[PDB]
Each structure stands twice: as structure tokens, then as C-alpha cells.
Amino acid sequence: NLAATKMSECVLGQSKRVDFCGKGYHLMSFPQSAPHGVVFLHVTYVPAQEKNFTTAPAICHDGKAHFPREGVFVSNGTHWFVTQRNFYEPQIITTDNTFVSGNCDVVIGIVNNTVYDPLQPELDS
Amino acid sequence: NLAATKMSECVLGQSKRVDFCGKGYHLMSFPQSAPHGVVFLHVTYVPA
Amino acid sequence: AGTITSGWTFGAGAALQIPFAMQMAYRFNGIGVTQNVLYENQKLIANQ
Amino acid sequence: VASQSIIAYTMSLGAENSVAYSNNSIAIPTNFTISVTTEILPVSMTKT
């Protein structure tokens, strides 16, 4: 039954269950025949190399609070970047990436920062 | 095996399965050892 | 320990330290409640 | 082959580790790996 489920969930689709498909964020599996049994060749994503960064749940442009739509805030030390969770790619924190919620007073950990607005250059230019 | 899955899925990550992690949208769980068994503290979200 | 400091990542491979308050933002993200809920009521949630 | 012997010891739980937990820092991986592991399960007994 477990085998069927694995075949059902792992082969037929990508299973969400942690450690169902093998250690790690599961990609996919290739079922293989065997005597009186089955063997699966799971393909799993495992993070290789890492780097520390300094984080804060938000940033204040105006004195208002910004949270990341997708990602977490980090900094190279000089500048703050927001990136995805499992593979590092920094991005310029713009309004396009961020969403509004509350003000600076409540936030815990929020840091002052500057958010880039793509609109301004269009009108001024 | 059920226990292992609970640690595997529920502890190690956050489970999507309704009524797997305790009644509610599941947040997380902390296992605690016990004699010949294990106790979980499923922390779940429930609307008030 | 890994569950607290690293989030879910410790199951996948190398555990990655992440501040706890951040984890709930993910965990709330897991249910369909955006991060803004947690921080906006961070103290209460912790107290609860 | 040398002066080999049988040893008994307290089994190592593994290399012990620790996570640099902090209010303000995250560990985000730069690169990853695509690995493959084998999970083996019995399907059927011999039809005796």
C-alpha cells in the first residue's frame, strides 16, 4: 500500500511530504522492477553550499513596513537584498517585490532601508 | 511508521494534511520522549 | 533543536539557522495566512 | 592485517553540532546538489 502510494504520489506526481520521497525537497522518482518487490530512484534536491546573512522581517521606506512577498531580507553588509528561501539570489528590493502591512513601531527586527520605485524614473524621464 | 511520518512530515516540515497534525491548520510540533512511545505537542491554528 | 533554530531545512540536509520569529512567518505562510499576521501580533502569539 | 582488535564503545550519536542561532541572521544556500538515493520495498511474497 505504501509502495502504491509512493508510486501514486512520488512517480505520478511530486510529493509534498517531507522525507516521503527520500531526504530533501523531492523532485521525482523512477520506479524500477525487482524480484518480489520494487525499487525507486528518487531524485531529491539537497542544498550544497551556504552563506550567512543578516536578516530582519521587514524594512521601512517611508516609516511604513514592508514584508517580502516571496523571500526573506538579507544583506551583503553594505546593502540589503531579499531572496528566495532555498537557493541564494539577491534582488533589488523594489515595491514590485514587496507588500505593505502596518508601520515601523510594531515590527520587531525591522530595519530602515530604501525601496526602489520603478515608476519614478519613467515619469521623470 | 505513523509516528515516524509524524516526525518526518509534521516535525521536520509543516504538514498540509488536515487532521493529521491535530485539529486545525497545522503549525508545527515538538516531540517529547516517553517510555516505549512518543508524545507530540501539535501546535495548531484554530479560528476564534 | 533543529526545529527551533533551523526551520524545516534540517530534514532536507544541512540545517540553516533562521531566527524563530522568521519561522512562524513561514509557518503561517504554510496555512494561507500571510506573515503580516504574526509580526503584527507577535507578542500575543508568543504569549498564547 | 596488523595488530587488529575488536573494540566496544559508546556508540556515537554522530558528530555533534550546533547552530548559530541569532535574532538577526539567516543561512541561505548558494548552491545545491541533485542527488539520487534508493528506497527499496517488498511488494509480494512468493505465491506458495
Coordinates of N, CA and C in Angstrom, one line a residue, chain A residues 10-118:
Chain A
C10 N 4.7 9.8 -5.6 CA 6.1 10.1 -6.0 C 6.4 10.1 -7.4
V11 N 5.9 9.0 -8.1 CA 6.1 8.8 -9.5 C 5.2 9.6 -10.3
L12 N 3.9 9.5 -10.0 CA 2.8 10.1 -10.7 C 2.8 11.6 -10.5
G13 N 3.4 12.1 -9.4 CA 3.5 13.5 -9.2 C 4.6 13.7 -8.2
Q14 N 4.7 15.0 -7.8 CA 5.8 15.3 -6.9 C 5.2 15.4 -5.5
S15 N 5.6 14.6 -4.6 CA 5.1 14.5 -3.2 C 5.6 15.7 -2.4
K16 N 4.7 16.3 -1.6 CA 5.0 17.3 -0.7 C 5.5 16.9 0.7
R17 N 5.3 15.6 1.0 CA 5.6 15.0 2.3 C 7.1 15.0 2.5
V18 N 7.6 15.6 3.6 CA 9.0 15.6 3.9 C 9.4 14.3 4.3
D19 N 10.5 13.8 3.7 CA 11.1 12.5 3.9 C 10.2 11.4 3.5
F20 N 9.3 11.7 2.5 CA 8.5 10.6 1.9 C 9.2 10.0 0.8
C21 N 9.7 10.8 -0.1 CA 10.5 10.6 -1.3 C 12.0 10.6 -1.1
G22 N 12.5 10.4 0.1 CA 13.9 10.4 0.3 C 14.3 11.8 0.9
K23 N 15.5 11.8 1.5 CA 15.8 13.0 2.2 C 15.8 14.2 1.3
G24 N 15.0 15.3 1.6 CA 15.1 16.5 0.9 C 13.9 16.9 0.1
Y25 N 13.9 18.1 -0.5 CA 12.8 18.6 -1.2 C 12.8 17.7 -2.4
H26 N 11.7 16.9 -2.5 CA 11.6 15.8 -3.5 C 11.3 16.4 -4.9
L27 N 12.1 15.9 -5.9 CA 11.8 16.2 -7.3 C 10.9 15.2 -8.0
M28 N 11.3 13.9 -8.0 CA 10.6 12.9 -8.8 C 11.2 11.5 -8.5
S29 N 10.6 10.5 -9.0 CA 11.1 9.2 -8.8 C 10.9 8.3 -10.0
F30 N 11.8 7.3 -10.2 CA 11.7 6.4 -11.3 C 11.6 5.0 -10.8
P31 N 10.4 4.4 -10.9 CA 10.2 3.1 -10.4 C 11.0 2.1 -11.1
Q32 N 11.4 1.0 -10.5 CA 12.2 0.1 -11.2 C 11.7 -1.3 -10.7
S33 N 11.7 -2.3 -11.6 CA 11.3 -3.6 -11.2 C 12.3 -4.2 -10.3
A34 N 11.9 -5.4 -9.7 CA 12.7 -6.1 -8.9 C 12.0 -7.4 -8.5
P35 N 12.7 -8.4 -8.0 CA 12.1 -9.6 -7.7 C 11.3 -9.4 -6.4
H36 N 10.0 -9.8 -6.5 CA 9.1 -9.8 -5.4 C 9.1 -8.4 -4.7
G37 N 9.4 -7.3 -5.5 CA 9.4 -6.0 -4.8 C 9.7 -5.0 -5.8
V38 N 9.9 -3.7 -5.3 CA 10.1 -2.6 -6.2 C 11.2 -1.8 -5.7
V39 N 11.9 -1.0 -6.6 CA 12.9 -0.1 -6.2 C 12.7 1.2 -6.8
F40 N 12.9 2.3 -6.0 CA 12.6 3.6 -6.6 C 13.9 4.4 -6.6
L41 N 14.1 5.2 -7.7 CA 15.3 6.0 -7.7 C 14.8 7.4 -7.6
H42 N 14.7 7.9 -6.3 CA 14.2 9.2 -6.0 C 15.3 10.2 -6.4
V43 N 14.8 11.4 -6.9 CA 15.7 12.4 -7.2 C 15.4 13.5 -6.3
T44 N 16.3 13.9 -5.4 CA 16.0 14.8 -4.3 C 16.9 16.0 -4.4
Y45 N 16.4 17.2 -4.1 CA 17.1 18.4 -4.1 C 17.6 18.6 -2.7
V46 N 19.0 18.8 -2.5 CA 19.6 18.9 -1.2 C 20.5 20.2 -1.3
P47 N 20.4 21.1 -0.4 CA 21.2 22.3 -0.5 C 22.7 22.0 -0.2
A48 N 23.6 22.4 -1.2 CA 25.0 22.2 -1.0 C 25.8 23.2 -0.2
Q49 N 25.8 24.5 -0.6 CA 26.7 25.4 0.0 C 26.0 26.6 0.5
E50 N 26.4 27.1 1.6 CA 25.6 28.1 2.2 C 26.5 29.3 2.7
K51 N 25.8 30.4 2.9 CA 26.5 31.6 3.3 C 25.6 32.3 4.3
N52 N 26.2 32.9 5.4 CA 25.4 33.6 6.4 C 25.0 34.9 5.9
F53 N 23.9 35.5 6.4 CA 23.5 36.8 6.0 C 22.7 37.3 7.2
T54 N 22.5 38.7 7.2 CA 21.8 39.3 8.3 C 20.4 39.6 7.9
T55 N 19.4 39.2 8.7 CA 18.1 39.3 8.3 C 17.3 40.2 9.2
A56 N 16.1 40.6 8.8 CA 15.1 41.4 9.5 C 13.8 41.2 8.8
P57 N 12.8 40.9 9.5 CA 11.5 40.6 8.9 C 10.9 41.7 8.0
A58 N 11.5 42.9 8.0 CA 10.9 43.9 7.2 C 11.8 45.0 7.0
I59 N 11.4 46.1 6.3 CA 12.2 47.3 6.1 C 11.2 48.4 6.1
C60 N 11.7 49.7 6.5 CA 10.8 50.8 6.4 C 11.3 51.7 5.3
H61 N 10.5 52.0 4.3 CA 10.9 53.1 3.4 C 10.6 54.4 3.9
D62 N 9.2 54.6 4.1 CA 8.5 55.8 4.5 C 8.4 56.0 6.0
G63 N 8.6 54.9 6.7 CA 8.3 54.9 8.1 C 7.2 53.9 8.2
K64 N 6.8 53.3 7.0 CA 5.9 52.2 6.9 C 6.6 50.9 6.8
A65 N 5.9 49.8 6.9 CA 6.5 48.5 6.9 C 6.3 47.8 5.6
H66 N 7.4 47.1 5.2 CA 7.4 46.2 4.0 C 7.8 44.8 4.4
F67 N 7.0 43.8 3.9 CA 7.4 42.4 4.1 C 7.6 41.9 2.7
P68 N 8.4 40.8 2.6 CA 8.7 40.2 1.3 C 7.5 39.4 0.8
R69 N 7.1 39.6 -0.4 CA 6.1 38.7 -1.0 C 6.6 37.3 -1.1
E70 N 7.8 37.2 -1.6 CA 8.4 35.9 -1.7 C 9.9 36.1 -1.4
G71 N 10.4 35.5 -0.3 CA 11.8 35.6 0.1 C 11.9 36.1 1.5
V72 N 13.2 36.4 1.9 CA 13.5 36.9 3.2 C 14.5 38.0 3.0
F73 N 14.6 38.9 3.9 CA 15.5 40.0 3.8 C 16.9 39.6 4.3
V74 N 17.9 40.0 3.5 CA 19.3 39.7 3.8 C 20.1 40.9 3.5
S75 N 21.4 40.9 3.8 CA 22.3 42.0 3.5 C 23.6 41.4 3.2
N76 N 24.3 42.0 2.2 CA 25.7 41.6 1.9 C 26.6 42.4 2.9
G77 N 26.0 43.3 3.7 CA 26.7 44.1 4.7 C 26.5 45.5 4.3
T78 N 26.8 45.8 3.0 CA 26.6 47.2 2.5 C 25.2 47.4 2.2
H79 N 24.5 46.5 1.5 CA 23.2 46.7 1.0 C 22.3 45.6 1.3
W80 N 21.0 45.9 1.4 CA 20.0 44.9 1.8 C 19.4 44.3 0.5
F81 N 19.2 43.0 0.6 CA 18.7 42.2 -0.5 C 17.6 41.3 0.0
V82 N 16.6 40.9 -0.8 CA 15.6 40.0 -0.4 C 15.7 38.8 -1.4
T83 N 15.7 37.6 -0.9 CA 15.9 36.5 -1.8 C 15.0 35.3 -1.4
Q84 N 15.0 34.3 -2.3 CA 14.2 33.1 -2.1 C 14.9 32.3 -1.0
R85 N 14.1 31.4 -0.5 CA 14.5 30.6 0.7 C 15.5 29.5 0.5
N86 N 15.6 28.8 -0.7 CA 16.5 27.7 -0.6 C 17.6 27.7 -1.6
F87 N 17.8 28.9 -2.3 CA 19.0 29.0 -3.2 C 19.2 30.5 -3.3
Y88 N 20.4 30.9 -3.0 CA 20.6 32.4 -2.9 C 20.7 33.1 -4.2
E89 N 19.8 34.1 -4.3 CA 19.8 35.1 -5.4 C 19.3 36.4 -4.8
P90 N 20.2 37.4 -4.7 CA 19.7 38.6 -4.2 C 18.9 39.4 -5.2
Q91 N 18.1 40.3 -4.7 CA 17.3 41.2 -5.7 C 17.2 42.5 -5.1
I92 N 17.1 43.5 -6.0 CA 17.0 44.9 -5.6 C 15.6 45.0 -5.0
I93 N 15.5 45.5 -3.7 CA 14.2 45.5 -3.1 C 13.4 46.6 -3.7
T94 N 12.4 46.3 -4.5 CA 11.5 47.2 -5.1 C 10.1 46.9 -4.6
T95 N 9.2 47.9 -4.8 CA 7.8 47.8 -4.4 C 7.2 46.6 -5.1
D96 N 7.7 46.3 -6.3 CA 7.2 45.2 -7.1 C 7.2 43.9 -6.4
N97 N 8.3 43.7 -5.6 CA 8.6 42.5 -4.8 C 7.9 42.6 -3.5
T98 N 7.6 43.8 -2.9 CA 7.2 43.9 -1.5 C 5.8 44.3 -1.4
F99 N 5.2 44.1 -0.2 CA 3.8 44.4 0.1 C 3.8 45.2 1.4
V100 N 2.7 46.0 1.5 CA 2.6 46.9 2.7 C 1.8 46.2 3.8
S101 N 2.2 46.5 5.0 CA 1.5 46.0 6.1 C 1.9 46.7 7.4
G102 N 1.2 47.7 7.9 CA 1.5 48.3 9.1 C 2.6 49.3 9.0
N103 N 3.2 49.7 10.2 CA 4.2 50.7 10.4 C 5.3 50.1 11.1
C104 N 6.4 50.9 11.3 CA 7.7 50.6 11.9 C 7.6 50.3 13.4
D105 N 6.6 50.9 14.1 CA 6.6 50.8 15.5 C 6.4 49.4 16.1
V106 N 5.5 48.6 15.5 CA 5.1 47.3 16.0 C 6.1 46.1 15.6
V107 N 6.9 46.2 14.5 CA 7.6 45.2 13.8 C 8.6 44.3 14.4
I108 N 9.4 44.6 15.4 CA 10.4 43.7 15.9 C 11.3 43.2 14.8
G109 N 12.5 43.9 14.8 CA 13.6 43.5 13.9 C 13.7 44.3 12.6
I110 N 12.6 45.1 12.3 CA 12.6 45.9 11.1 C 13.7 46.9 11.1
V111 N 14.3 47.1 9.9 CA 15.4 48.0 9.8 C 15.1 49.0 8.7
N112 N 15.7 50.2 8.9 CA 15.4 51.3 7.9 C 16.1 50.9 6.6
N113 N 15.5 51.2 5.5 CA 16.1 50.9 4.2 C 15.4 51.7 3.2
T114 N 15.9 51.6 1.9 CA 15.3 52.4 0.8 C 14.8 51.4 -0.2
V115 N 13.5 51.6 -0.6 CA 12.9 50.7 -1.6 C 12.9 51.5 -2.9
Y116 N 13.2 50.9 -4.0 CA 13.3 51.5 -5.3 C 11.9 51.4 -5.9
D117 N 11.5 52.5 -6.5 CA 10.3 52.6 -7.3 C 10.6 52.7 -8.7
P118 N 10.2 51.8 -9.5 CA 10.5 51.8 -10.9 C 9.7 52.9 -11.6

